[PDB]
Structures are given as structure tokens and as C-alpha cells.
Write a protein that binds this ligand. Structure first.
Ligand SMILES: *[C@@H]1O[C@H](CO)[C@@H](O)[C@H](O)[C@H]1NC(C)=O
Ligand SMILES: *[C@@H]1O[C@H](CO)[C@@H](O)[C@H](O)[C@H]1NC(C)=O
Ligand SMILES: C[C@H](CS)C(=O)N1CCCC1C(=O)O
Ligand SMILES: [Cl-]
Ligand SMILES: [Cl-]
Ligand SMILES: [Zn+2]
Length: 574
């Protein structure tokens, strides 16, 4: 039945391209114009694609993959045997698809109002408050309000969501949804591997945490910051305290060595979202990589519509499975942070284009982490003072430590948060956490890993996890933890390939063809081989490692230890 295998795969591919392209269409229309009609159509298309999935998934299961020779064929068929949600009986599938849509819409349209009538949306209103306000009470208002409006509204949907996604998981041979999600890495030692990486970054995070806590103590008062306890979750410049770069002004190591207001500069010289993406497109091409198609610039939504339209603002890259149509949907704002995000998303597009000629079943990254890392890698070089200066956005060890601190506030602070999200979800999926303890366990992990505490006590009815995009949107999060670790591994490898000598953090791979070549050969593999092969192609070795990230920040770790030591900080939070 070997010849039958090849035929089946060829047929699965042809048909899947058509149906998946059609689905992307409806999905895109809903995401870029949330309405009753677009929602209705999306739900209808869900059943259509599920029908396709069931038809081929059923046939695929009749193949004893064990008996198949061709490994590339063996691999595709094994993947098609997994029906995902399509495994759910029609009634549950319909209810499931609606739950997902209701949670997404609820999160996307949530607003926080004032007594008068001024209501703020998450993007860019609340996001801006969290990033620029230095008033304890105003930060609290936005922080609590977002959770009161978005978080609480998602709670009514989560338990049923968990029940259905787990059922689908069990119907596909997994013990639960978390199991199914983790399988995407094809790594039996995943959990222990991730745990080890997390532990390796502890010294660095705990030291960053202690330094920032001291700075907040200095700004917000001793009566509000316990130098031996967790940091209130609304003071880090970000709604989820996942990245702390926005409070750089409160923690600058050497305030005597000032740096230009990058954002002010961008706005000052008329930078626009389109300009931001163009610059990213240029960085990829400079490496010899592929430029985005003209179609990209015409169909993408690079700005928040003013049509009055309601949309899903969270940044995302789209592959329409026809090897020609690729788009980015992002409510881009003109500032450095979003400039990095633009590169992030462009990295996804580059990946799409790179493996566009493989069977659609294999048109995925080596693993989800790889897909998230590509753009961040280039953005690391983009963020260097030298590169920013070349873009006319910027104008000495002190400047060096300040830069490292700025990078750390984003990259190091994110490590514990990115680790925490799915630790929580895996436990919800496996039944360890019931709806009675959703929130309480969320905060135990928030405390355990990030050393954060809620500024206001939480109450029955609260569901803060629902206030984070990926939860109601049901998008796995561990990919971002993996990404942040491996992107430094890639940076290190690419820099060495470019001939860079000296401190890793000073490397800029701009215009390096040797660098673009390694990324290219790896991306071309798509999901055709276990990820360690792609890892090997890029770095010369096969494992995930925190060494690159540690080496990158070494100078900062040394500075932080000395600084915290002379101030007598007690690391951690008893
Ligand atoms: C928003 O979707 C509706 C369908 O409900 C459609 O009629 C309208 O034209 C769409 N708006 C834009 C700007 O495309
Ligand atoms: C395995 O099948 C795939 C898909 O048909 C084909 O591209 C590949 O060359 C085949 N490999 C071998 C060794 O036959
Ligand atoms: C934008 C991307 C997704 S394509 C996303 O959700 N990310 C990746 C960086 C961390 C992050 C997040 O929570 O915003
Ligand atoms: Cl929270
Ligand atoms: Cl993932
Ligand atoms: Zn991404």
C-alpha cells in the first residue's frame, strides 16, 4: 500500500490548498471586520473545512504508518490522522467553534469606560496608559478595568471551552489538550528541557527583578513597594507585565548618559506603519532573503481601521496557502516597540515564503518556537544603537550598560511570563486546576515565576487569564518561551557566520549574506524534518541552550550583581 500512500498525499495536498485558502479568506474577513455577517460566514466555513478534514483524516487512519517506507510520506499521513477539532461530533464541533468565536469577539470589543463616558479600547488607549502613566492610581484603573471588562467576560466561556478542546484531544489519541499542544515539538523531554532552560535564566531574572523593585521603591514610595516581596503587577509599563521596557526611564543605569527619544524621533521624522514594515522588508532582503510580494502591501492591514470597523488588533501573519498571498494584520503604532513587532511579523512572512513549495501539510516551522524567533533575530540587530543611529533614531560602557538594560527589560523579563502561561493551561487541561481555582492558581504562578502580586485583591468572578489575548484566542504560548531562548542561539550563530568579533550584544548582521543563507536553508525545511535538524543547520549543534542568551547579557549580569550587592538587595521574594 506504498503507492496508495503517495497518491493519497498528493490528493490531500491539492484539495487542502483549495479549502484552506477559502477558510483563510473568511477568517481574514472576520478578523479585519468583526460583524454578525462575517462571523456567521466564518462559522459556516468551519464546518466546510472540518468536513474535508474528517474525510481525509478518516482515510489517513486506515494507513498503518508503521508499514510505510518513504519517511516524508510517513510523516504527512501521521499528521493527517490527527483531525483536531474536526474529531468532535457535529453538535459539539458547532458549539466549540462558536465558543471560540464568542471569546475572540468579546476580547476584541471590550472597552473600559469612565464615569463621564470616555471609553478606552486596549489598543492603543489602555496600552498607552500602562506605558506612560506614572500615577499609581491611574495605572490601577486601567489594569483593574481591563480585567473587570475583558477577563471577567471570558469566564462564562472557559470551562466549556476546556471540556470541548480536551474531548477533541482525547478523540485524536491524546490524554488532553495540553498533551496535544506539546506534541507539536516532537520532544518527549520537552517539559524537563524547558524547566532546565528556565532555571538557567533565574540568576539573571532575579537580579533584574531586584534592581527594578528598588527603582520602583524609589519612585512609588516605601509604603507601596516591599524590597523583600513581589512587585505590584501594574507598575511594569505593560498590561501583563510581560515586558518592562516602557519603564526604562525609571531604571536607567546611567542617567548621565542619555539617549534620544527613539519614539519621539520616529514621530519627529514622519515615520509611518508602512515605513516601519518597509524597513523590515529591507533588512530581510539585505540578508539575501526574499522581499514580500506586491500583493502583501495591497491586502495587509498595517493600521487600525478608521472605518468604524471593529477588528482583532493583536499582531499576526497570515499564509493563504497558495504560495502567493501573504499578509500581516496589525494595529501598528509609531514607536520602537512596534518596530520590533513589525520585524517579528515579517519573520513569519519570510518563513511562509521560504517553504511555500512544500506539501501544505509540512508548511509550518521546524516547531512553533522557530516560527516566532525568525523576526526577533533580525530585530535584535535592528535594536542596536549603531543600527538605530543609521536610521537616524539615535545619536562607552555606560551607554553599553544602558542598552543592555533596555534589552533585558524586554527579553529577560519575558522569560518567566512566557514560561508561566502554559504551565497554567497545561494544568487546567489535565484537570489539576478546576474552574474554582482558575484565578488563584494563575496568581500563584505569577508569584512563583515572575515575583509579581496583584495590586488589588482578586475576587470570585475574576478571571485575569482571560484578559490576556492567547487565552480566549486559544493560541499556545510556550512557543514564545522557546523563541526567546533560541533566538539568541540564532543571533550568536549568525553573528559568528557574519564574522563578528567581540561582545555578542554589539553584533549587527545587517546585509550579511552568510547569515541569510543559514536562515534560508533552515526555513526551507518547513516541518519536513524534526526540529533538531533545523537547529543544527543554523547553529552547528542540535539542542536548545540558554548559553547564547547568557553570553549576550553577561556584562549586564555582572553589573547587576555588583549594583544589587552594594544596595544589599535580598533576591527573590520571601
Ligand atoms: C464589514 O463587514 C460588513 C458585513 O457585515 C460589510 O458589508 C462591510 O462592507 C465590511 N466593511 C469593510 C470596510 O469592508
Ligand atoms: C517521498 O515522497 C515525497 C512526496 O511524494 C517525494 O518528494 C520524495 O522524493 C520521496 N522520497 C523517496 C526517497 O522516495
Ligand atoms: C505577536 C505575537 C504573535 S504572531 C504574540 O502574541 N507575541 C509574541 C511576542 C510575545 C507575544 C505576545 O504576548 O504579544
Ligand atoms: Cl494578570
Ligand atoms: Cl506552541
Ligand atoms: Zn509571532
Amino acid at each position: 500500500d506504498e503507492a496508495e500512500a503517495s497518491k493519497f498525499v498528493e490528493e490531500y495536498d491539492r484539495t487542502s490548498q483549495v479549502v484552506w485558502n477559502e477558510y483563510a479568506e473568511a477568517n481574514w474577513n472576520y478578523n479585519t471586520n468583526i460583524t454578525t455577517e462575517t462571523s456567521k460566514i466564518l462559522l459556516q466555513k468551519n464546518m466546510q473545512i472540518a468536513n474535508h478534514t474528517l474525510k481525509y483524516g478518516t482515510q489517513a487512519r486506515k494507513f498503518d504508518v508503521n508499514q510505510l517506507q518513504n519517511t516524508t510520506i510517513k510523516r504527512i499521513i501521521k499528521k493527517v490522522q490527527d483531525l483536531e477539532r474536526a474529531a468532535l461530533p457535529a453538535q459539539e464541533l458547532e458549539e466549540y467553534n462558536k465558543i471560540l468565536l464568542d471569546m475572540e469577539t468579546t476580547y476584541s470589543v471590550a472597552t473600559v469606560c469612565h464615569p463621564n463616558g470616555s471609553c478606552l479600547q486596549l489598543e492603543p488607549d489602555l496600552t498607552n496608559v500602562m506605558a506612560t502613566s506614572r500615577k499609581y492610581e491611574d495605572l490601577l484603573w486601567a489594569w483593574e478595568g481591563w480585567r473587570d471588562k475583558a477577563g471577567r467576560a471570558i469566564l462564562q466561556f472557559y470551562p466549556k471551552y476546556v471540556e470541548l478542546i480536551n474531548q477533541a484531544a482525547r478523540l485524536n489519541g491524546y490524554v488532553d489538550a495540553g498533551d496535544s499542544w506539546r506534541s507539536m515539538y516532537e520532544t518527549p523531554s520537552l517539559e524537563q528541557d524547558l524547566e532546565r532552560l528556565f532555571q538557567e535564566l533565574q540568576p539573571l531574572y532575579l537580579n533584574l527583578h531586584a534592581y527594578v523593585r528598588r527603582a520602583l521603591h524609589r519612585h512609588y514610595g516605601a509604603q507601596h513597594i516591599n524590597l523583600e516581596g513581589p512587585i505590584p503587577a501594574h507598575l511594569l509599563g505593560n498590561m501583563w507585565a510581560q515586558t518592562w521596557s516602557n519603564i526604562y526611564d525609571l531604571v536607567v543605569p546611567f542617567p548621565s548618559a542619555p539617549s534620544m527619544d527613539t519614539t519621539e524621533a520616529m514621530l519627529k521624522q514622519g515615520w509611518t506603519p508602512r515605513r516601519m514594515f518597509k524597513e523590515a522588508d529591507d533588512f530581510f532582503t539585505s540578508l539575501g532573503l526574499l522581499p514580500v510580494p506586491p500583493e502583501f502591501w495591497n491586502k495587509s492591514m498595517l493600521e487600525k481601521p478608521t472605518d468604524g470597523r471593529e477588528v482583532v488588533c493583536h499582531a499576526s501573519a497570515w499564509d493563504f496557502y497558495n504560495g502567493k498571498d501573504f499578509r500581516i494584520k496589525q494595529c501598528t503604532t509609531v514607536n520602537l516597540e512596534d518596530l520590533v513587532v513589525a520585524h517579528h511579523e515579517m519573520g513569519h512572512i519570510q518563513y511562509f515564503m521560504q517553504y511555500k513549495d512544500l506539501p501544505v501539510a509540512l508548511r509550518e516551522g521546524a516547531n512553533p518556537g522557530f516560527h516566532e524567533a525568525i523576526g526577533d533575530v533580525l530585530a535584535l540587530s535592528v535594536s542596536t544603537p549603531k543600527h538605530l543611529h543609521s536610521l537616524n533614531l539615535l545619536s562607552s560602557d555606560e551607554h553599553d550598560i544602558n542598552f543592555l538594560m533596555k534589552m533585558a527589560l524586554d527579553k529577560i523579563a519575558f522569560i518567566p511570563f512566557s514560561y508561566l502561561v502554559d504551565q497554567w493551561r497545561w494544568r487546567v487541561f489535565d484537570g489539576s486546576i478546576t474552574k474554582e481555582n482558575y484565578n488563584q492558581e494563575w496568581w500563584s504562578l505569577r508569584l512563583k515565576y515572575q515575583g509579581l502580586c496583584p495590586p488589588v485583591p482578586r475576587t470570585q468572578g475574576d478571571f485575569d487569564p482571560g484578559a490576556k489575548f492567547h487565552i480566549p484566542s486559544s493560541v499556545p504560548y510556550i512557543r514564545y518561551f522557546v523563541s526567546f531562548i533560541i533566538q539568541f542561539q540564532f543571533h550568536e550563530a549568525l553573528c559568528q557566520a557574519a564574522g563578528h568579533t567581540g561582545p555578542l550584544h554589539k553584533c549587527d548582521i545587517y546585509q550579511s549574506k552568510e547569515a541569510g543563507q543559514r536562515l534560508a536553508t533552515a526555513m526551507k525545511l518547513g516541518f519536513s524534518r524534526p526540529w533538531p535538524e533545523a537547529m543544527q543547520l543554523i547553529t552547528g549543534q542540535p539542542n536548545m541552550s540558554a548559553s547564547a542568551m547568557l553570553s549576550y547579557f553577561k556584562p549586564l549580569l555582572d553589573w547587576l550583581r555588583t549594583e544589587n550587592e552594594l544596595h544589599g538587595e535580598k533576591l527573590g521574594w520571601p
